[PDB]
Amino acid sequence: FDLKSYLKERQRQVEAALNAILPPQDPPLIYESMRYSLLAEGKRLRPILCLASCELAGGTAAIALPTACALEMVHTMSLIHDDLPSMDNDDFRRGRPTNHKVYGEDIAILAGDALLTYAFEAIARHTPEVPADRVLKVIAALARAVGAEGLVGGQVVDLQSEGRDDVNLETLHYIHTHKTGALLEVSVVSGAILAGASEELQEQLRTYAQKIGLAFQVIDDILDITKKATYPSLLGLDASREYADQLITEAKAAIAAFGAEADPLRAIADYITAR
Amino acid sequence: FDLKSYLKERQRQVEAALNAILPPQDPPLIYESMRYSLLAEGKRLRPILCLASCELAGGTAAIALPTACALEMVHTMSLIHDDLPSMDNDDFRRGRPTNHKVYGEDIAILAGDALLTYAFEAIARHTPEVPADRVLKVIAALARAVGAEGLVGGQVVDLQSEGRDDVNLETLHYIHTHKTGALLEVSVVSGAILAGASEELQEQLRTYAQKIGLAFQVIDDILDITAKKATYPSLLGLDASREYADQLITEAKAAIAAFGAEADPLRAIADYITA
């Protein structure tokens, strides 16, 4: 399976969709700020996982593309807010000034707020050929994933953990499953819901997304060391490596029943451990 | 019509709903910050307009109460973000410290983000009986109203207008219809949509909400000078501003003139503004 080629094609398609679904409008400054962060270079993993889960569950890319775009908008608003001086205080991201360094903190906050709202608008208004009740379940699932039970909850426990000496593995698990996991889970589940997948298929994809998310975090901590409590700091390097391998095993196991449709998802799992 | 008595009863109902729909949960700090701003003293005009519009269009309070709560959550997140040092830099609001002075700017930003998301979750998850397609229309309408075409667009043109000497009546009209009007418009329209009102009834209520919003702003500007920023008095003159306020309330009551009973609370709110 040519993962490099699949990812490059899908990245191009998502970037073209994002550019078309949020065109330059009035007032020009707020649209420019939003698009400055949204159309910046990125892997587009969340939209790609949404389109791949839809296809695997028998749906078309077309029905899931608004939701795919929405997932990137929510991801983008979390980065804009996190770069703020009040939060991680970053002047640069991937070689490019951060939104607030170019437009001011006030415009950056507002660009984040407008992207979060546009995510919900795009799902509700533009999702084609899916019954309303299923589109509503996606709205509810995305709202749960991004808010205090998900992304925001994770950010808040992480902030409270800064410079503590007592951060344990339960705390680390909560932070990673909420700060990053919740949005990965809803990326795959939303694609499946739009396609009209069974609860069983939804739970399989949820398992896959949680596991690859945790795997990515364990391997990143390993690559850093290749006071912040990390998987290596608590488990030890060799135990961390085994944990990462167990997570990708359980991720691939969750989608073992399918054929060629699951190959892109299998390849993404493999790539993480190969990194 | 006893407005004082109607408002006190509806305020009690909304505050009970708000407290129940967002109970204290884990992580405790984020829920505490959210509730600190959400359950603070207020008129609850937006939820009240939602319940009143639903009833007027033949719906029940019960079908609109999650949306009513959602409108207050969005209003609350706008105040939290606006009080930030990056924006209006307010240490106090209605006698009490602002969210960021109590919890820090990071928790305040995240509490705002989590309230905006919960607004959409509450509508999608808890709206009873109303068919899904109409609940989706409310999600879309609220997203349009809060984002760059509405509240955020208004805030951005307002920020760009600070310390300009060329601010004209078109700019002032845009700011007030978008910064404050759009959320008032969607408060009444959302109630009507949930009830299954005609486009005609929706446009009548929209006209009413825009006009009372403008009327409130013109009268506030009058009361500031009665007791460089371009105002209605600075551009129109005091006596012309007074006539504009009276014309707005006239056009607002005219919009709902055909009704006879459930329009009385909306008529009373128009009257209150001119007083």
TrEMBL record, chain A:
<keyword id="KW-0460">Magnesium</keyword>
<dbReference type="GO" id="GO:0005737">
    <property type="term" value="C:cytoplasm"/>
</dbReference>
<feature type="binding site">
    <location>
        <position position="88"/>
    </location>
    <ligand>
        <name>Mg(2+) 1</name>
    </ligand>
</feature>
<keyword id="KW-0479">Metal-binding</keyword>
<comment type="similarity">
    <text>Belongs to the FPP/GGPP synthase family.</text>
</comment>
<dbReference type="InterPro" id="IPR054848">
    <property type="entry name" value="GGPPSyn_CRT-like"/>
</dbReference>
<dbReference type="Pfam" id="PF00348">
    <property type="entry name" value="polyprenyl_synt"/>
</dbReference>
<keyword id="KW-0414">Isoprene biosynthesis</keyword>
<dbReference type="InterPro" id="IPR000092">
    <property type="entry name" value="Polyprenyl_synt"/>
</dbReference>
<keyword id="KW-0808">Transferase</keyword>
<dbReference type="InterPro" id="IPR033749">
    <property type="entry name" value="Polyprenyl_synt_CS"/>
</dbReference>
<feature type="binding site">
    <location>
        <position position="221"/>
    </location>
    <ligand>
        <name>Mg(2+) 2</name>
    </ligand>
</feature>
<protein>
    <recommendedName>
        <fullName>dimethylallyltranstransferase</fullName>
        <ecNumber>2.5.1.1</ecNumber>
    </recommendedName>
</protein>
<feature type="binding site">
    <location>
        <position position="82"/>
    </location>
    <ligand>
        <name>Mg(2+) 1</name>
    </ligand>
</feature>
<dbReference type="GO" id="GO:0016114">
    <property type="term" value="P:terpenoid biosynthetic process"/>
</dbReference>
<dbReference type="GO" id="GO:0004161">
    <property type="term" value="F:dimethylallyltranstransferase activity"/>
</dbReference>
<dbReference type="GO" id="GO:0046872">
    <property type="term" value="F:metal ion binding"/>
</dbReference>
<comment type="pathway">
    <text>Isoprenoid biosynthesis; geranyl diphosphate biosynthesis; geranyl diphosphate from dimethylallyl diphosphate and isopentenyl diphosphate: step 1/1.</text>
</comment>
<dbReference type="InterPro" id="IPR053378">
    <property type="entry name" value="Prenyl_diphosphate_synthase"/>
</dbReference>
<dbReference type="InterPro" id="IPR008949">
    <property type="entry name" value="Isoprenoid_synthase_dom_sf"/>
</dbReference>
<feature type="binding site">
    <location>
        <position position="90"/>
    </location>
    <ligand>
        <name>Mg(2+) 1</name>
    </ligand>
</feature>
From TrEMBL, chain B:
<dbReference type="InterPro" id="IPR054848">
    <property type="entry name" value="GGPPSyn_CRT-like"/>
</dbReference>
<feature type="binding site">
    <location>
        <position position="90"/>
    </location>
    <ligand>
        <name>Mg(2+) 1</name>
    </ligand>
</feature>
<dbReference type="InterPro" id="IPR000092">
    <property type="entry name" value="Polyprenyl_synt"/>
</dbReference>
<comment type="pathway">
    <text>Isoprenoid biosynthesis; geranyl diphosphate biosynthesis; geranyl diphosphate from dimethylallyl diphosphate and isopentenyl diphosphate: step 1/1.</text>
</comment>
<dbReference type="GO" id="GO:0016114">
    <property type="term" value="P:terpenoid biosynthetic process"/>
</dbReference>
<keyword id="KW-0808">Transferase</keyword>
<dbReference type="InterPro" id="IPR008949">
    <property type="entry name" value="Isoprenoid_synthase_dom_sf"/>
</dbReference>
<dbReference type="GO" id="GO:0046872">
    <property type="term" value="F:metal ion binding"/>
</dbReference>
<feature type="binding site">
    <location>
        <position position="82"/>
    </location>
    <ligand>
        <name>Mg(2+) 1</name>
    </ligand>
</feature>
<protein>
    <recommendedName>
        <fullName>dimethylallyltranstransferase</fullName>
        <ecNumber>2.5.1.1</ecNumber>
    </recommendedName>
</protein>
<dbReference type="InterPro" id="IPR053378">
    <property type="entry name" value="Prenyl_diphosphate_synthase"/>
</dbReference>
<feature type="binding site">
    <location>
        <position position="221"/>
    </location>
    <ligand>
        <name>Mg(2+) 2</name>
    </ligand>
</feature>
<comment type="similarity">
    <text>Belongs to the FPP/GGPP synthase family.</text>
</comment>
<keyword id="KW-0460">Magnesium</keyword>
<keyword id="KW-0479">Metal-binding</keyword>
<dbReference type="GO" id="GO:0005737">
    <property type="term" value="C:cytoplasm"/>
</dbReference>
<keyword id="KW-0414">Isoprene biosynthesis</keyword>
<feature type="binding site">
    <location>
        <position position="88"/>
    </location>
    <ligand>
        <name>Mg(2+) 1</name>
    </ligand>
</feature>
<dbReference type="GO" id="GO:0004161">
    <property type="term" value="F:dimethylallyltranstransferase activity"/>
</dbReference>
<dbReference type="InterPro" id="IPR033749">
    <property type="entry name" value="Polyprenyl_synt_CS"/>
</dbReference>
<dbReference type="Pfam" id="PF00348">
    <property type="entry name" value="polyprenyl_synt"/>
</dbReference>
